[PDB]
């Protein structure tokens, strides 16, 4: 198994580090800037030795070293104009070198960039995905667990839609070790105002990390990606929210959007859960924005 | 941190093995049969070396080697003969390691956790039995199989005895936060299929026995270890375990399988709002545990 | 997609399954001849997996045809004469069902039984091995680390070849510092080291005499680490039963020796021995050769 | 109740936190002088924790008094003149707030900065150390394993001396699964010229990473620190090369320098192995430089 990291910045490097700790595969660290992937590859090699990992690591500036890659993680970029061009190029490269790879897009804007990759990849839509939902879900589930003074380990939630202010958090589909969130407002352990406070924090978390750390989150995104890698390689069928190809699900077809999905051997597959009309309405507006910003994107690339 | 296994049979040995794999603490393997814990201790030590674990392991037949234990895992036994064994372990824990968190495993479980309380005189929050997590594990695994998904995020509350008056709450079953109800709506699983799964979960212990000619060992050990983990690392994880109810679910002054958080200071019950058919099934379960527990204490004299 | 087939679902095979699940090595096929035993243990491992968050497929079966295209084979099936018959049958089954699997034999007597597997499997010799040396090495390295009041983690040793072990003090080191340096500084004695050697020689029997059962956890861990090295193309250096082909003056026999395991199987390594280092080993290699031909004769 | 206090929340300190979370070593305090950085990184590690099922508490602070009663201290604070300023202040703070912590200094120049910390903390000398040898050892053993086409897992080596240009790698104390390196030169599987090449690479590895990645190694240093943390907390007695207080060992007195040591409950304890005269010579001269640059250091700080 060869895991190709297209982009060897902060997120790509920590994905490699975590793919080594768990023995997921050999690493290809690719970047456009000479020297950066070679230096980080050497560091990961010594890290590997210290911790008893024997996987192969190669830092390269030559994209043809992506050949027969089973996994692809795209963080290449720095936005809609400059990253879309980069994403188109990587897309073409993935077609002629590693057409049978499972592809996890990360570059922002996410839901826009996953569609750009699809249009120019000619890859199957089930073999393509973006990571967003798991990061929003984790922040929401952590904030709920803190207030309920419980471990986050068994706090579960569905959050539909794009990675931004077009989130759709489903309180209906939130549970604490199988006990719905409702049961906790019932027992006056949490209030609806507190839950809506938590939702806006979840919506603003990306910007809050940036304002404090003067840099976008890296560790949590890397962990989300690694778990999507894991799900695919080990045919796990785990249920995530991800950018995924809808095909009639939630009244939408022919667009990658943040949705519920299974990841396994054959890729990322949407799941349709029964929504209210206010749940499906908010989501359709969310899906509409992604549709308009994606076609503006395709045109700006001209 | 010293983790004391009172009973070095099939389950106790795998608890040690798993607490070594995760570096939970030093092990004291105690048993009544001479030589058995010493032999198994040596094996776990070579196992430890092979995989790079440095925790100390001591196999002994001397119960006084239980002193200052932080964790206690009781598998000692084979209602009459195990309850009198459990009384002895209880007394031993009283004078040697009174401030230990205690995880009872010996069967019948909810009966034996009460036996331990009566004779240990330990605080009620420092005592527990493992049952619910093992039943929950079989139920959620069977649900995940039918729904063609990973079990990893299938969660469920199961109240009551570790037996054939289990109370599985379909209301409190969810798949990555989505209630099971949503899956019967979309016809991905049926109510009869779910009642299949319930009778299977109730009969799994006997089916393992009837197939393997031995009671389950790995899954129980894993359930115990996760309760050990929750306590040592102050995790506040939400399990179903045997726990001291005191008004919760209309029951007071009895250990029974219930919802609880485990942390630093022990095992703490949580009362969720049940229907009356949910609370009725549970109260009858709680009634049997109360009747068999007083039956139990009687045969021990 | 990686399939790990356990031929034998007793104490060792069950713990090998458990450990390959904990480490996500692959899907499991638990095979046994006794009806119900692998099905029961498979169910237990499934619930164990759920508790610990492992998603691998688990199949308990009594039909050997379910071992098809297995990448890994772990043979614990048995109970001298009668285990060889069992091993011959397992060998034939592996050629018809899973001919390109890497094969780790465990059933005793070990060096005799892996040779039995070779004669009847028609498998390549590099794809076959038995687990022994790692268990003797670990016990020796554990006892040394205890005496030196050090972690075992970086105590390494070569032991070639039961009563016919070859512990090489010259090839013993503590994080790269030879054992030599520790007797120099009066931290351990030559008599202490020879006591430790005999404890290592007698460890199997005393575990039996104390626990009234042969070791299971440590053997399972040794096997899992050979499984690991093969699947992840690790090239780790073990002592195991391995096919010698001129190495150490011996050819055409599986014997306990130094080997690297990788993608391509188990491959002997020849280190430079003195002459009674090689002399003692040649007697050991002679013992395995006579009892192996004794074995093949008793099997008819 | 184990508290791991990271004094410095840059690249190395952040990955130390991440790795002590993956292994459940303790709760984290991320301290830094720059407002917002530790708070932001703490949030990221918290969400990282949720995704991977870790429940240990993490707090990012700009208030140094928040390291109180810490069991572990990892000092990466800095950027000889100005970092000695920082290390003296950190030293004083550790004295009055967490005097019984085991202290792992990382800021460089390492062997110089560990002595600075000792002078102004007055902590017990067995409770103070710097991480260097394990990073040099890993690079050397990695390069040896590559040549010999073997797993690095059982390549072991002693490297004495400063973390710089006068390292002292002991081929005598190099072994492959217990077999000395010499046995491989006999078998013509490696040459001494190749081994001296490997030594020059090991000596220059830090600068080579810098020139390629335009940033110092982070992953491997963090892993070295974490395993030193591990050895201490779990009373492991593992044998490392670290900066440690020698007092008569190797003809050296009253100075922290890279040497062989056991780490356990009670701290870091030197071990003296029998060296030849060429081995002890090369070591005394490195030890001489560390002494001269440490005396330069103490003078520059006033
Ligand atoms: N979807 C999420 O939830 C999540 C969360 C936070 C950030 N983001 C986004 O993920 C992306 C990655 O973040 P990061 O920390 O890794 O950024 P980074 O700067 O640290 O790394 C990006 C790398 O891509 C490289 N690059 C640029 N052009 C390239 C090309 N044409 N081919 C190959 N490589 C190329 C850059 O040299 C750089 O090394 C960012 O756009 C960020 O905004 C995603
Ligand atoms: N709580 C649950 O959900 C659940 C599930 C499975 C098993 N069980 C029960 O857990 C118990 C242990 O299972 P096991 O496989 O490990 O049994 P085991 O026979 O293999 O080990 C029990 C050990 O306790 C020893 N022992 C006997 N008397 C003793 C005494 N007076 N003091 C100390 N030790 C003593 C025995 O010699 C034996 O070594 C069984 O009763 C089993 O039915 C409970
Ligand atoms: N190489 C070593 O260092 C070492 C160390 C310890 C044990 N051993 C040996 O490993 C072997 C297994 O040990 P164990 O405790 O796990 O044995 P076990 O009895 O507990 O399990 C062996 C299984 O093989 C099964 N079996 C029997 N006949 C079979 C057949 N014809 N086909 C398939 N399966 C069949 C048995 O039913 C049994 O379930 C023993 O021979 C033991 O002596 C080797
Ligand atoms: N010991 C070794 O073997 C080895 C190897 C590599 C790196 N280093 C050194 O380890 C140290 C850390 O490396 P890094 O990548 O993490 O550096 P970094 O710049 O990325 O992070 C250091 C942090 O210390 C902070 N800081 C600055 N001044 C401070 C003060 N007065 N008090 C508290 N904090 C303060 C900075 O804001 C910065 O965030 C560096 O000196 C590095 O050069 C040592």
Numbering used by the authors:
A (entry chain B): 2 to 79, 90 to 313
B (entry chain D): 2 to 79, 91 to 313
C (entry chain C): 1 to 79, 91 to 172, 175 to 313
D (entry chain A): 1 to 79, 91 to 313
What does the paper say about this structure?
Malate dehydrogenases are a group of multimeric enzymes, typically self-organized as dimers or tetramers, that reversibly catalyze the oxidation of malate to oxaloacetate using the reduction of NAD+ to NADH as a cofactor. Malate dehydrogenases (MDHs) sustain tumor growth and carbon metabolism by pathogens including Plasmodium falciparum. However, clinical success of MDH inhibitors is absent, as current small molecule approaches targeting the active site are unselective. The presence of an allosteric binding site at oligomeric interface allows the development of more specific inhibitors.
In addition, the atomic coordinates of the loop R75-I87 located between helices α3 and β4 sheet of the catalytic site of chains A–C were omitted due to a lack of electron density, caused by an increase in local structural flexibility. Similarly, disordered active site loops were observed in the NADH bound form and no electron density is observed for residues Q80–L90. Eighteen identical residues (G8, G10, L30, D32, G40, D71, G84, D89, L90, N94, P120, L146, S227, and A233 with D147, R150, R87, and N119) cluster at the N-terminal cofactor binding domain (Rossmann-fold). Five of these (H174, R150, R87, R81, and D147) are involved in the catalytic mechanism where the three arginines interact with the carboxylates groups of the substrate (malate or oxaloacetate) through ionic contacts. Overall, the three independent oligomeric interfaces of PfMDH possess a buried solvent accessible surface area of 3481 Å2. In contrast, the AB and AC interfaces represent the key contact surface for the oligomerization (1811 and 1309 Å2, respectively) and are essential for the biological activity in vitro.
